Specification:
Elements (H helix, E strand, L loop, with lengths): L6 E5 L4 H16 L3 E7 L13 E5 L11 H26 L4 E7 L5 H7 L4 E5 L3 H8 L1 H6 L29 H16 L4 E3 L10 H6 L5 E3 L12 H11 L6 E5 L8 H14 L3 E4 L19 H5 L3 E4 L4 H5 L4 E6 L3 H10 L3 E3 L6 H11 L3 E3 L6 H11 L4 H16 L4 H15 L1
Parallel strand pairs: 1-2, 1-4, 2-3, 4-5, 5-6, 6-7, 8-9, 8-11, 9-10, 11-12, 12-13
Bound molecules: uridine-5'-diphosphate.
């Protein structure tokens, strides 16, 4: 097997939407014959028992922490508090097995791994877990400031169709200058690696593919969708599947806003009443930590909601999302348009309604609704009226046919001969050549 005898160390950023593709990549590479060490902070640490073919080294992260505000601060804090323990753990790993790490594969957001890799003389490959389209925005961010797109709504960003100003990637309560600093750091430490892995396919990116290559001085591998590649479900996850088994085919709206976005009580109430008033069956994930600054207890739902929706809805703290999405009862997906959830909806043929919040979410949601046209976007603060219109519109009536095509195209790119199967074999060769 091609990689046997080659030790790769993969470094995810410690949140689920980053851990998940890094470890899909990990399992894929292990199946190509590599030995895989994951190094991870204790923060949101994955379960080793779900990845029995991977070796796990857990490091102290020196920290709770809010994930929906002050995002540049949090992400700089993750880099900083983990850096010294990472350095010492990598050095101990080399010393403790002089019998050698071939490569470091690092989340693009962990820009601290560049200095670490240079000091250890190790080659780096950067994994970008956001949408490849969003990279184009990050790369030309100061140019978008130049042309007066930023700061600040529906004006077409002509350089980046179909994006509007309001779709450009950003973080709450954050100035253009802070955005330019941060994005330029991630862009630079991606461009300084030996290669960049993108979690998408040649076909999904066809409209921008030439442009993408030109924004990187280094080779690019389109190995996704990586989700197309556990050992025990929690109580909340297993109830998801048992409840769906009772529901009519394609009748369920699955609702989940990822692992890190946040809401206040009032937005959650509008969600809830919009959901209830739409009268659609729904599986709603309200993760611990979604709702901030409230004084009420999980699931923070308005009084009367459970009563009005008994029989129609199921509320949980976590869902086995990928199994939920291929489940025959699931007919739509209200997402925040995180890239993993976008891909997972595409791979499952499930039309989506998008309420993006920050980062590439706003890019992805516009792509879902305008470019791939496999779903719709809620524009805006959530308001129950507009939400119910969106949910009834999603679950009624074509979009499904385009979603079916996209799904089939994703199946074909990952099998033998597919562009992503090819691209992963070139990646393996790039790794072996280092
Ligand atoms: O109840 C949930 C919610 C999310 N996810 C997974 O968490 C990840 C979230 O990544 P995404 O890019 O969608 O958003 P992020 O969480 O990074 O904002 C995806 O792989 C989802 O399948 C899950 O397994 N269960």
């Amino acid at each position: 097997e091609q990689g046997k005898g080659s030790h790769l160390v993969l470094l995810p950023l410690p949140f689920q939407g980053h851990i998940n593709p890094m470890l899909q990549l990990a399992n894929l590479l292990h199946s190509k014959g590599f030995s895989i060490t994951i190094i991870h902070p204790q923060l949101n640490s994955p379960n080793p028992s779900d990845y029995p073919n991977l070796n796990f080294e857990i490091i102290p992260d020196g920290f709770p922490q809010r994930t929906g505000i002050k995002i540049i601060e949090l992400l700089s804090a993750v880099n900083t508090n983990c850096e010294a323990p990472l350095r010492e753990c990598l050095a101990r790993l080399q010393a403790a097995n002089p019998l050698p790490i071939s490569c470091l594969i690092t989340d693009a957001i962990l820009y601290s791994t560049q200095t670490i890799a240079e000091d250890l003389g190790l080659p780096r490959i950067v994994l970008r877990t956001s949408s490849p389209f969003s990279f184009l925005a990050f790369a030309m961010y100061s140019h978008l400031k130049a042309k007066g797109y930023l700061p600040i709504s529906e004006i077409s960003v002509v350089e980046l169709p179909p994006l509007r100003v309001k779709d450009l990637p950003g973080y709450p309560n954050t100035d253009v200058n802070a955005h330019s600093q941060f994005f330029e750091k991630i862009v630079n430490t991606t461009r300084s690696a030996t290669a960049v892995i993108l979690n998408s396919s040649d076909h999904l990116e066809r409209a921008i593919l030439p442009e993408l290559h030109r924004e990187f001085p280094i080779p690019i591998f389109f190995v996704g969708p990586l989700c197309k590649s556990s050992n025990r479900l929690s109580e909340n996850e297993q109830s998801c599947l048992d409840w769906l088994d009772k529901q009519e085919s394609r009748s369920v709206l699955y609702v989940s806003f990822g692992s890190v976005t946040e809401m206040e009580e009032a937005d959650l109430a509008e969600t809830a009443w919009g959901l209830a008033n739409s009268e659609q069956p729904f599986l709603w994930v309200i993760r611990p930590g979604l709702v901030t600054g409230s004084e009420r207890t999980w699931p923070h739902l308005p009084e009367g909601f459970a009563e009005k929706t008994k029989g129609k809805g199921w509320v949980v703290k976590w869902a086995p999302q990928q199994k939920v999405l291929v489940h025959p009862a699931v007919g739509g997906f209200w997402t925040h348009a995180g890239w993993n959830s976008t891909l997972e909806g595409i791979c499952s043929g499930v039309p989506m309604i998008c309420w993006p919040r920050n980062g590439d979410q706003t890019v992805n949601a516009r792509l879902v609704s305008c470019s791939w046209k496999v779903g719709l976007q809620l524009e805006g603060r959530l308001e129950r009226g507009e939400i119910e219109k969106g949910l009834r519109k999603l679950m009624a009536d074509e979009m499904r046919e385009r979603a079916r095509v996209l799904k089939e195209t994703a199946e074909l790119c990952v099998i033998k001969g597919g562009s992503s199967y090819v691209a992963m074999n070139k990646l393996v060769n790039h790794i072996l050549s280092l």
